[PDB]
UniProtKB/Swiss-Prot annotation:
Subunit structure: Interacts (when auto-poly-ADP-ribosylated) with AIFM1.
Localization annotation: Cytoplasm
Documented effect of changing R93A: Increased affinity for DNA damage sites
Sequence positions that bind NAD(+): H90, G91, S92, G99, R106, S132
Source taxon at top rank: Eukaryota
Effect of C136R: <0.5% of wild-type activity
Domain PARP catalytic: 16-238
Function noted in UniProt: Promotes AIFM1-mediated apoptosis. This form, which translocates into the cytoplasm following cleavage by caspase-3 (CASP3) and caspase-7 (CASP7) in response to apoptosis, is auto-poly-ADP-ribosylated and serves as a poly-ADP-ribose carrier to induce AIFM1-mediated apoptosis.
Organism: Homo sapiens
Effect upon mutating Y214H: 14% of wild-type activity and increased branching 15-fold
Protein name, as recorded: Poly [ADP-ribose] polymerase 1, processed C-terminus
Active site: E216 (for poly [adp-ribose] polymerase activity)
Underlying gene: PARP1
Effect seen on changing D221G: Abolished interaction with TIMELESS
Amino acid sequence: SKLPKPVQDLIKMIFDPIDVNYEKLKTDIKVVDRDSEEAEIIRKYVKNTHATTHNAYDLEVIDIFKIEREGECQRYKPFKQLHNRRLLWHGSRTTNFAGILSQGLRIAPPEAPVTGYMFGKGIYFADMVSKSANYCHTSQGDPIGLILLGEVALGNMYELKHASHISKLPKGKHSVKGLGKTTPDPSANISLDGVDVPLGTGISSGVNDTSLLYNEYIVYDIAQVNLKYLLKLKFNFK
Ligand SMILES: NC(=O)c1cccc2nc(-c3ccc(C(=O)NCCc4nc5ccccc5[nH]4)cc3)[nH]c12
Ligand SMILES: OC[C@H]1O[C@@](CO)(O[C@H]2O[C@H](CO)[C@@H](O)[C@H](O)[C@H]2O)[C@@H](O)[C@@H]1O
């Protein structure tokens, strides 16, 4: 295989020779240099947005991959210039990633219940790396996890303090923001190619009557998501 060794390692991690498995993902995968500005920004995002109540583990970045899923950017076009585009976290079990990279993030079918979907059947993201990392269900035995950075086209946000359990938004609303008590310091936000990166260290939001500790972002159209990076993380438990 002519692929870089980090990419070979990733392929083995989420699965028949290696190259056919790579072509099975239908995804261009490049290694972001560890000494690049991209990598510095992403490591800062990981460092600053770890919650205090997720003190069960520390996160260390092993490898950062730049991913382009076949056809995804072509279908994100309708939302490419939509205001309020943010770079957000999405965690998931390693076992799922083979699907995620080949089919993209997807929404539960209409026949599925709304139980367990705090803000309806959609695609969920976080601005706190620990909140997304919790959804990797990493164990002390296998302390390596995968997590996505995705450009989400949030547009006009429906800001909610309590759960709705429905996936239908009012007219002129493109996403839902679950308001948490703690948000990244907005004066530290930066723009990485027209896309906001809320990598500020956590502070209080002032939102009082909220059921969430940290923010959530939900979109209800797969075309509103554009995966940009895939991180491999060492979980260091206490
Ligand atoms: N992955 C992230 O980075 C991420 C980030 C921020 C908020 C997030 N919410 C989810 C989430 C939601 C819903 C589901 C989901 O299949 N429920 C349906 C199944 C179900 N029945 C339940 C009944 C009770 C309690 C929990 C339940 N989950 C999974 C993940 N993932 C989030
Ligand atoms: O009521 C939705 C509101 O937003 C728009 C933006 O074009 O549609 C977005 O929101 C819906 C989410 O439920 C989806 O129908 C659609 O895919 C999504 O882009 C408008 O259609 C509408 O005014």
